[PDB]
């Protein structure tokens, strides 16, 4: 399985004609291109090494598309001000996510088109790529307008066509980096907690991709409802970090084992506190 997504944000700037618009492309959850209207000379830039394989014609065409989107978001932002009886003079945000997932059979598994206003669900294209799910009353206005205009067909065509074509290309071009792993480096630390009780923390560092599972066991059972699991966070060098901790009786630390599961590990790691 594999995916391409563009994540777009327009933020209105009070008194100003143009919003700030940012578009970020992802393949398999790795940022690979970015456009930002706030630059001196706004242009799409590569964000993954393997996008060096595209020539100047690619960057020109995609740059022109971004400026088109910026205008589409400008007009939409104004329309939304009216739907919600909002005064101008404040900032508002409009976001879009779109793209496609490929299955293991390498065909289109699903296409996506979703919009959010003020960080809340607004309208989405249904999986059928024909009907819309409008989140509130204002969005029903848009749903009816897009049904009237037959907007969905145009989106369907991109998602089943150009989205799939380009994701295949990016996967081929980026194969050697996108298909790689960096298995976690793991260790257990030991910490004071409270009277007669200590914390064991099982660390996983420098891993890629970000998907991972950490578990703790006592007497052959997972501590499902009894561990603190930190949110996965970037190391800042392209790899990720996570940890899982448990509070345990002082003197019983050796009864606990941490397991680490990751694509880069043929067999899961089994770890313990080692004083």
């Amino acid at each position: 399985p594999h995916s391409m997504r563009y994540f777009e944000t327009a933020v209105s700037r009070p008194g100003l004609e143009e919003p700030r618009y940012i578009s970020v492309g992802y393949v398999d959850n790795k940022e690979f291109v970015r456009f930002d209207s706030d630059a001196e000379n706004p242009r799409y830039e590569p964000r993954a090494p393997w996008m060096e394989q595209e020539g100047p014609e690619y960057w020109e065409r995609e740059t022109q598309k971004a400026k088109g989107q910026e205008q589409w978001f400008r007009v939409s932002l104004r329309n939304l001000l009216g739907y919600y009886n909002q005064s101008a003079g404040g900032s508002h945000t409009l976001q879009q996510m779109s793209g496609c997932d490929l299955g293991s059979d390498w065909r289109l598994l699903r296409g996506y088109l979703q919009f959010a206003y003020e960080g809340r669900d607004y309208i989405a294209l249904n999986e059928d790529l024909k009907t819309w799910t409008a989140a509130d009353m204002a969005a029903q206005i848009t749903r009816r307008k897009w049904e009237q205009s037959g907007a969905a067909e145009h989106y369907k065509a991109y998602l089943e066509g150009e989205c799939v074509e380009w994701l295949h290309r990016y996967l081929k071009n980026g194969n050697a980096t996108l298909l790689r792993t960096d298995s976690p480096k793991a260790h257990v630390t030991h910490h004071p907690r409270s009277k007669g009780e200590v914390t064991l923390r099982c660390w996983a560092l420098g891993f890629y991709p970000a998907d991972i599972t950490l578990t703790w066991q006592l007497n052959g059972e997972e501590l499902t409802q009894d561990m603190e699991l930190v949110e996965t966070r970037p190391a800042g060098d392209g790899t990720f970090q996570k940890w899982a901790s448990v509070v345990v009786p002082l003197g019983k630390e050796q009864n606990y084992t941490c397991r680490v599961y990751h694509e880069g590990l043929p067999e899961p790691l089994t770890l313990r506190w080692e004083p």
Partner: peptide
């Protein structure tokens, strides 16, 4: 290569 939205705005 990203989607150009339908000429129809929100």
């Amino acid at each position: 290569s990203q989607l150009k939205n339908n000429a129809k705005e929100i």
